[PDB]
């Protein structure tokens, strides 16, 4: 039994294919070390935070909120972080996300006992998982867009490091 993504390599033992986006991709064998539920919860958190970060980088190129342009000047992307650490935006967001992540710590503790699916916060206010096939399709789409947004945020921020422009300022010329 060889892995589908890497055909010359043996299939990982902790990868069943039951999870969304499972193509059997683990050449370094990380799933043998960690719990797979912990690893999937980490992957979902990294991917969702990266989805919000990618959308935020694009939107902060597109437009700015009222008054932000005087506080930050012309210091787009990660350059605002330091500035807004001098202001109170970053501390406020850190406090509220720390609250949410205390409750996420309780949720992870319940995941590690086998009584919670990884990344399952049961947050579906506008009901979209109304059918068990749309649920699988949305799970695959969430994990794929999370990985894509992880690498997209990496690209946007490191290209900003080289150029100082931004994701859409770079495409402007």
């Amino acid at each position: 039994a060889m892995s589908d993504s890497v055909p010359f390599l043996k299939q990982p033992e902790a990868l069943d294919g039951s999870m969304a986006g499972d193509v059997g991709f683990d050449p370094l064998g990380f799933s043998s070390i960690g719990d797979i539920n912990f690893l999937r919860e980490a992957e979902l958190k990294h991917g969702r935070i990266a989805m919000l970060a990618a959308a935020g980088s694009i939107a902060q190129d597109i437009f700015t909120f009222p008054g932000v342009s005087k506080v930050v000047g012309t210091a787009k992307m990660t350059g605002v972080h330091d500035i807004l650490v001098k202001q109170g935006a970053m501390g406020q967001l850190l406090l509220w996300l720390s609250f949410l992540e205390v409750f996420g710590t309780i949720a992870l503790l319940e995941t590690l006992d086998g009584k919670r699916a990884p990344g399952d916060f049961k947050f579906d206010p506008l009901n979209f998982s109304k059918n068990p096939e749309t649920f699988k399709r949305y799970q695959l789409a969430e994990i794929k867009n999370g990985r894509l947004a992880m690498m997209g945020v990496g690209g946007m921020v490191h290209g900003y490091f080289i150029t100082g422009k931004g994701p859409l300022e770079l495409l402007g010329n």
Partner: protein, 90 residues
């Protein structure tokens, strides 16, 4: 006398064979010996390189090389785990 308590999941790892069982590696019990040996070589190289970068220590050391210098004592435990997994048929 009274029962001595242990944390949950505590097993008997006493061994008299050539190598210990893989359970003594804890979370690394399922890592193959080749992966352990490769990681030990890589950890030695990275730790030695980072250490040699920070041997003329200044008042502003690079944090990345400071973190990477800790892989040099990690590589010892890695090659011990490599020997254990190699003599455990893994």
């Amino acid at each position: 006398y009274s029962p001595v308590p242990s944390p949950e999941g505590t097993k008997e790892v006493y061994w008299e064979t050539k190598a210990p069982s893989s359970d003594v590696l804890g979370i690394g019990a399922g890592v193959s010996s080749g992966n352990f040996a490769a990681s030990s070589v890589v950890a030695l190289m990275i730790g030695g390189f980072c250490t040699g970068q920070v041997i003329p220590l200044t008042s502003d050391p690079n944090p990345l090389f400071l973190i990477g210098s800790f892989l040099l004592p990690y590589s010892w435990a890695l090659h011990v785990a490599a020997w254990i997994q190699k003599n455990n048929g893994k």
